[PDB]
């Protein structure tokens, strides 16, 4: 049972991983991108801070 599941469950976290690191990009770049308001030199600062 354990093995059966730990096997299935592991692939489920490996899926959750990439699906999650995505959330991280989407959150961070929607943030840097938000620098359009202040100057483009602001993007350099913002985007460097982020990416």
């Amino acid at each position: 049972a354990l093995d059966s599941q730990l096997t299935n469950d592991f692939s489920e976290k490996s899926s959750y991983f990439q699906s999650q690191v995505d959330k991280i990009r989407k959150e961070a770049y929607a943030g840097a991108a938000a620098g359009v308001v202040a100057g483009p030199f602001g993007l350099i600062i913002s985007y460097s801070i982020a990416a």
């Binding site: 049972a1 354990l2 059966s4 599941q5 469950d9 489920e12």
Partner: protein
């Protein structure tokens, strides 16, 4: 839909496991049964032969 994959993994896992236990349980009970017989079936032949 991750939950879906999960919940069922859970069920199948534990069931499939019980099934194994059950299968293994039988095997031993078979062994016993047969062995028990092979033992008597064996003393017996000698005796019938003697008779």
């Amino acid at each position: 839909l991750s939950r879906f994959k999960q919940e069922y993994s859970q069920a199948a896992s534990v069931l499939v496991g019980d099934i194994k236990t059950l299968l293994m349980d039988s095997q031993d009970k078979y062994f016993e049964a047969t062995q028990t017989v092979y033992e008597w079936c064996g003393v017996a032949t000698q005796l019938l032969a003697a008779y």
